[PDB]
């Protein structure tokens, strides 16, 4: 089981996403179902450790945003081209 | 000393293109497009020349539009 803590992005775009990855974070999005897509932000080192397991990309994950748990699955991940880092993750609502 | 070439040539630029754009009021007979083929096609009140030149048969504003099943580009003169 993986429990991830997230925060709703106050601002979006290229400059913001570069600036989060400056401040050791990275954006993600939760989508799927009838609910609207949710633009979140994660801590990079936690999720980078959690993703080393295939359990991460197989099991159902709990994302806590505003104290609201969301069971999702890792649909797709954008990785850094030559560094062991994460750019962005798509989460599908289970 | 030595060398040569075989690739020195090129031809003159024929100044094709779109001479009057959309929403641009023209007189009758005004050349809209010069072109080789029918990259565009003649719509309403627009004639096609010998060299596939698109000219206005009437006066009014140019309307670019895509019609037909093949999504071909037609040029028409709206009335005004």
């Amino acid at each position: 089981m993986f429990t991830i803590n997230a925060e709703v992005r106050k601002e979006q775009g290229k400059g913001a996403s570069r600036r989060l990855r400056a401040a050791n974070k990275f954006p993600a999005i939760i989508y799927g179902g009838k609910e609207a897509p949710l633009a979140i932000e994660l801590d990079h080192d936690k999720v980078m450790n959690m993703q080393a397991k295939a359990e991460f990309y197989s099991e159902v994950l709990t994302i806590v945003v505003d104290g609201k748990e969301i069971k999702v699955k890792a649909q797709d991940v954008q990785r850094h081209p030559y560094k062991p880092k994460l750019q962005h993750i798509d989460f599908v609502r289970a | 000393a030595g060398g040569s070439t075989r690739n020195g040539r090129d031809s003159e630029a024929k100044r094709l293109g779109v001479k009057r754009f959309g929403g641009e009021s023209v007189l009758a007979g005004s050349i809209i497009v010069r072109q080789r083929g029918t990259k565009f096609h003649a719509g309403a009140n627009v004639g096609c020349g010998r060299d596939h030149t698109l000219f206005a048969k009437a006066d009014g504003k140019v309307k670019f539009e895509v019609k037909g099943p093949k999504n071909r580009k037609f040029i028409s003169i709206e009335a005004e």
Binding site: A54, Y57, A74, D76, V77, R79, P81, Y82 | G2, G3, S4, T5, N7
Partner: protein
């Protein structure tokens, strides 16, 4: 030495080598040698690094080569002035962007692939790194 058999044209512009790469993930095999730097390689550098890892695995396992040198590089001869046509095609390169997986390998352990890709990377001008097959 890798080289296109036919080409539609004999010569090519110098171009540029900006942008990020596309062959980023380890597609086929298990271990990969990923380019970090930027530049152009050649068929000689490719074949030398292939030899160094084929010998380092003692032809055990399977090696993919993801790149192919398709860009011809011309040079003018010595004591020839700067005019009078484009120079003659001398060798072939592959433009390498950061992130390009250059080689892949499987059927061997990880440590053997490390020492093989290190022996190969000593023949290559660009700075490389070692990567593994990521799930997703």
């Amino acid at each position: 030495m890798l080289q296109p058999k036919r080409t539609k044209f004999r010569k090519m512009h110098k171009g540029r080598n900006r942008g990020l790469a596309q062959g980023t993930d380890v597609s086929f095999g298990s271990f990969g040698l990923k380019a970090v730097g930027r530049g152009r390689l050649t068929a000689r550098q490719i074949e030398a690094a292939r030899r160094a890892m084929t010998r380092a695995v003692k032809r055990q396992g399977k090696i993919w080569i993801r790149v192919f040198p398709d860009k011809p590089i011309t040079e003018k001869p010595l004591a020839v002035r700067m005019g009078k046509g484009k120079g003659n095609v001398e060798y072939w390169v592959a433009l390498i962007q950061p992130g390009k997986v250059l080689y892949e390998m499987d059927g061997v352990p990880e440590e053997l692939a490390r020492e093989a890709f290190k022996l190969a990377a000593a023949k290559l001008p660009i700075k490389t790194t070692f990567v593994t097959k990521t799930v997703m």
